[model samples]
Target: DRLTNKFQLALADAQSLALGHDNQFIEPLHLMSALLNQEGGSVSPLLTSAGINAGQLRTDINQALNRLPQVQPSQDLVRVLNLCDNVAQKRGDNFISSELFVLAALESRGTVADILKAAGATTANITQAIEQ
Candidate 1:
């Protein structure tokens, strides 16, 4: 499922950043990096299926991040971690869960869910998974 794939990508990105010698924690920038790297991942495929290219989404997200005021690296990491936590909690997941990925998709104003629906997914299915 798209939500699962997106969550996996985000998780992989977070783990990569956390494990990197230079990076101590997962950050929004790392998340962005992961999204950018997965050209055929959840978000990208969703956009494509919706006839909405993800390139612009990437640009906009990066621009939004870059526009934010500068802060200490740790502080920036905290911000990203908090973002992850916020989405996780909203979807009733202990950590960054698949539901969080869907929420992210919804928040993105992108075609994440639409793409999933097009691919024969339903909210009930996703919600049930989270509940489990």
Candidate 2:
């Protein structure tokens, strides 16, 4: 459905990025990287909206990707996507999207969040930027 269409290519790109970076799994970091790299994609707009440096984030993503284990989806990543579903549901949407996926990753109580923090991104700042 819509959700599948929304993430399919990005997810595939993420998996490729993961493999290239020696990540053991296709994690949210991979997802975010793919989304950000998407020309004119929602995720890139949010980065600019939030005043985050996409290039720097990309660099960080690569570093994080290299640090990850090369494998399938992690339990944490599954939960992250579920949060994306929750985000979509709150708006009464039937399909999940990358924007919510990025938000969920930033708000995650895991390494994803830590990565954002390392890049000087806070949930409130990113939220405000996206809402703008």
Candidate 3:
């Protein structure tokens, strides 16, 4: 719950970005972008410390997004949000919680987790962050 508002805002921004791009479905790319847009905040520090240059990460995500076929916005958002939901469910949570957000960050493979680990974040720390 540390980054509760920030997490929600990121989700909202992802939704807005998907809508703006005429993408009906939200994708990893949108979520990636949304997370990257958080600068100097809780998750942002973790992501940056992990060596993920937010800008470059966004570029990579956008490139991936470009390869995907376009779909309707509402459906896309649902699907994309569901991806987040599924990830959360993997941790035995009924809803997409802050821990899910941290997992999303850790799963980035884009320097996010690397930075967190560098900042003394272990798998245990991450799990605790989620549980809290």
Using TM-score, give the best candidate's number: 2
- Every model: Cα RMSD to truth: 8.6, 2.2, 6.4
Candidates in descending TM-score order: 2, 3, 1
Model 1, TM vs. native: 0.41
What range of 10 consecutive residues in model 3 has the weakest lDDT sum? 72-81
Q: Which lDDT tens digits does candidate 2 get at residues 1-132?
A: 457574777887887877787777778878888988987577877777777787888888878777765437767788898888887787676678777776788778777678777776777777676556
Query: Per-prediction TM-score, please?
Result: 0.41, 0.84, 0.54
Q: Candidate 1: what lDDT? A: 0.49
Off by over 4 Å in 2: 1-4
- Model 1, residue 1: distance off in Å is 16
> Which of candidates 2 and 3 is the stronger one according to TM-score?
2
Evaluate candidate 3 by giving its C-alpha RMSD to the native, one decimal: 6.4
Scored by lDDT, the top model is: 2
Q: Give, for candidate 2, the lowest lDDT window spanning 10 residues.
A: 65-74
lDDT of each: 0.49, 0.76, 0.57
